Every structure is written in structure tokens, then in C-alpha cells.
Design a protein around this ligand. Structure first.
Ligand SMILES: *NC[C@H](*)CC(=O)OC
Lengths: 75, 369
């Protein structure tokens, strides 16, 4: 299904996920499209940091939700 | 008194040029310099040369992507202002909490050590728009010109070497100076694959030329990480070591006493690869412990010297953090640049110039001569 990932600066990424996907897998999908190392990623949904081991259903992330990718921009 | 700005005689001439032409209406300030001028009350001709220089330095911003997000067109800074700002250096006493290793390679000092940092802007050979001032200066139709690069680094480094020669003498010690690959990273732009020998040659040229003025300088420890050969070179009385940490295992860190020095015999000074447009520490004002500038600022109390706040050192991440009274209940908006914004802190301190006789003096005095 569709979820949207969006940086503080407004860059938008679209991912193909399942509710069974773990946040680790989701950070790997972001690295796949953008090359951002999962180490540098903070994913925020509804004010909560998303723990690496939990799943997209744990946080009730459904189709076409928007996650927030908090990055610390590189020179 | 927490930090001291220095600049060369040639730079002072540039500043006098600029001030004279503004006074006549024949030059126009850049937007950021104009904002600083308009926050105070003196006209250009009413203010002395030191105040003028201070207000230009004050137009710097905490964090700037100097190689890609500066326009050199007067909407931020003009090239005339850029030419001056690139020559300004700043030194400060610091506590060094780790050896300055990048990433996760830093080693914490069991007892933090006392030393000094001297932030010096590298030759900026990268731009996201038009050519930079340094590009116009040291490139000849694209060719790097070693002699011109030599003159640029001499201009920018010598005032700090003169300063710390004198400081070593006053403390009845010698100076040990660690130097990184200044200007060799993102600053080198398209020259990244050729820049390394040019920088080492400039450092050797400066030391050879001014050896007679630096009797209390003892050890220079140059570490460009990769891309140069291990070496010791005797330059007069001085020992110049080329020790690239990616090439020589066990190299002492930039924020650590090089071999043959210790706190009882030497003051420890580290040159920081700085930039024209930022406050000292650049990237770490945005919380990033990245680049020589950001790493050394994060690994020292640089931010405390600049802001006057008492930070707290985080051993796990090798970072000097803002006060806990500030960061509590500020998650996501707690980095040092946020502290400066909310408190309206400005970058502005005492300034001296190196006169033709190798003495540091007020800008007014050096201009009189
Ligand atoms: N922080 C600036 C570095 C530029 C770069 O990554 O070149 C590829």
C-alpha cells in the first residue's frame, strides 16, 4: 500500500509497504529510493518517534498516511 | 574576551578600501552587512575602522553551507565583503573533551585537556552559483596557482602563528600546532583530486618564510587524513610532521598533544578549517558533529566561549550540549543555533591586525602606519 514520507524541508517520498513491515524495513525502503542511511533517520508519526522493532500496524499507520523524516542536513 | 579575531595587513587595506568607498557612495553593502549596520546608530564615516570591521564580521550566520548555498551577489554578501571575511580568523582558549576523531572514532580524554583553537577559513573553491572570491584570486583560467594559494594561506594563517608564538613565550612554553587538511574537502570543489599537495606546500612555504619570526613554535602536526606521504621535515628549528590518520596507524588526534609535546612543555593549538560566512563551529550550530569545523567545535567548549553559556559534555556522542535548563522541554529545537536565536546572541569581539613589522595591534594603529 501507499504511505508518504516527508522531510522537514518538504521533500516527499512514496513507499510501497504492508502493515506487517517493520520500521527497520521502512527505513531500508527510504535508503533504497534516497540513499539516506537508516542511522540518520528519525521517523515521526503523530508526535511519536517510531521504534525500529515495531510494525506499521502497531502505530496504526494505514494507507496514504504521511510519516515525517527528521534529518540533520549534510554539507 | 572569550575569543579574539585577527587579520592581515593586506586584509586591513581591503577593509580601508571598502569603508572609504562606502563613505563616498561608490560602493554598496550586501544585504546581511546592511542589516547589521542598521541595528546601530553611527554612520559609516562616524564609526572607527574596528567598529566597521566588527559589524561586517557580525553579519556571519551560525550555520552556512558555504560551498553551495551562498550567492555572492549582494542578496547575502558581496564579493568585496567575501574577500574580507575569508581573511578573518578567530582564536579562543578551549577545553578539549576528546581527541577530535570524526564519526565514532573519537577517544574521550580521561581528564579533559587545556588548549586553544584558531579558526581559519580555507580557500573556497566551490560554489552553487557564480565563482567565489577565492576562485577569482587563486585560479588562472581554471588552473590552480600554487604561488597565489600560498599567498592566501600566508595572509590568513600568519596572524594566528604570530599570536601563538607570543602566547607560548608569555607562558614560558613552546607551541605545538595540529593542522587538518584545510580546504581539501567540500571546499576544494572540482579540485578534490589535486588539492592535497597544494595545501601541504602552502603550509611548508609559510613556515619556511617566517621561521625567524616563530622561535617559540616547535611542532606542526599536519593530518590531511588521506592523500599524502608520511614525513618529518625540519623547517629551521621547527618539526613539521605529515601524518595522515588514514595512512599512519596510531596518529595522535587533532585535539591531542603530538609526539614530543605535553602540557608542561607546550601549549596545544589546533587550526580549524573554517569558512567565510559562518560562526566558528558552523555545522555543529545545527547539531551536526561533521566536518573538521563541526567536529572540533562539538568536541570542545567552543559554543560556551561564543555564547557565554555553560554547556555539558556528552561522552557517548562526543558532543558539548547546551545547558539542561535549555534543552529540557525543547526536544527537536534544542541545538546550539536555537540557543543563539532565542537569545539574540551576535558574533562580535575584539579584532587586531598584523602590521608590517610582525606585531599585532589595533586596526587604528596599524592604519596610522
Ligand atoms: N558538505 C559538502 C560536501 C559536498 C559533497 O558531498 O560532494 C559530493
Amino acid at each position: 500500500m501507499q504511505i508518504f514520507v516527508k522531510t522537514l524541508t518538504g521533500k516527499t517520498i512514496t513507499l510501497e509497504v504492508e502493515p506487517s513491515d517493520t520500521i527497520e524495513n521502512v527505513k531500508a525502503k527510504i535508503q533504497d529510493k534516497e540513499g539516506i542511511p537508516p542511522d540518520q533517520q528519525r521517523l515521526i508519526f503523530a508526535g511519536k518517534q517510531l521504534e525500529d522493532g515495531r510494525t506499521l500496524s502497531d502505530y496504526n499507520i494505514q494507507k496514504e498516511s504521511t510519516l515525517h523524516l527528521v534529518l540533520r542536513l549534510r554539507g | 574576551s572569550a575569543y579574539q579575531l585577527l587579520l592581515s595587513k593586506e586584509t586591513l587595506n581591503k577593509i580601508l578600501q571598502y569603508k572609504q568607498n562606502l563613505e563616498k557612495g561608490l560602493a554598496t553593502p550586501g544585504k546581511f552587512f546592511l542589516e547589521e549596520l542598521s541595528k546601530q546608530e553611527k554612520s559609516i564615516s562616524e564609526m572607527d575602522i574596528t567598529t566597521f570591521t566588527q559589524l561586517l564580521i557580525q553579519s556571519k550566520k551560525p550555520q552556512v553551507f558555504a560551498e553551495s548555498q551562498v550567492y555572492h551577489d549582494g542578496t547575502d554578501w558581496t564579493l568585496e565583503e567575501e574577500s574580507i571575511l575569508g581573511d578573518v580568523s578567530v582564536n579562543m582558549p578551549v577545553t578539549m573533551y576528546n581527541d577530535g576523531g570524526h564519526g565514532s572514532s573519537f577517544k574521550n580524554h580521561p581528564k579533559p585537556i587545556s588548549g586553544y583553537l584558531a579558526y581559519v577559513p580555507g580557500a573556497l573553491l566551490a560554489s552553487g552559483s557564480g565563482p567565489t572570491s577565492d576562485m577569482k584570486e587563486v585560479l588562472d583560467n581554471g588552473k590552480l596557482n600554487q604561488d597565489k594559494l600560498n599567498a592566501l594561506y600566508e595572509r590568513r594563517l600568519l596572524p594566528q602563528l604570530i599570536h601563538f608564538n607570543e602566547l607560548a613565550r608569555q607562558n614560558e612554553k613552546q607551541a605545538a600546532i595540529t593542522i587538518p587538511g584545510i580546504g581539501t574537502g567540500c571546499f576544494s570543489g572540482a579540485y578534490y583530486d589535486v588539492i592535497k599537495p597544494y595545501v601541504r606546500n602552502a603550509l611548508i612555504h609559510i613556515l619556511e618564510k617566517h621561521k625567524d619570526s616563530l622561535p617559540y613554535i616547535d611542532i606542526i602536526h599536519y593530518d590531511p587524513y588521506m592523500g599524502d606521504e608520511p614525513a618529518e621535515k625540519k623547517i629551521g628549528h621547527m618539526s613539521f610532521r605529515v601524518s595522515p590518520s588514514g595512512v599512519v596507524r596510531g596518529t595522535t588526534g587533532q585535539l591531542d598533544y603530538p609526539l614530543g609535546s605535553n602540557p608542561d612543555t607546550h601549549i596545544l593549538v589546533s587550526i580549524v578549517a573554517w569558512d567565510h560566512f559562518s560562526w566558528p563551529g558552523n555545522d555543529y550550530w545545527g547539531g551536526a558533529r561533521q566536518t573538521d569545523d563541526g567536529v572540533k567545535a562539538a568536541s570542545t567548549d567552543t559554543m560556551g566561549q561564543v555564547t557565554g553559556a555553560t554547556g555539558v559534555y556528552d561522552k557517548k556522542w562526543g558532543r558539548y550540549m547546551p545547558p539542561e535548563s535549555f534543552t529540557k522541554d525543547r526536544k527537536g529545537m534544542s541545538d546550539w543555533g536555537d540557543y543563539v536565536r532565542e537569545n539574540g546572541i551576535v558574533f562580535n569581539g575584539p579584532v587586531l591586525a598584523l602590521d608590517k613589522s610582525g606585531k599585532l595591534d589595533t586596526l587604528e594603529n596599524v592604519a596610522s602606519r
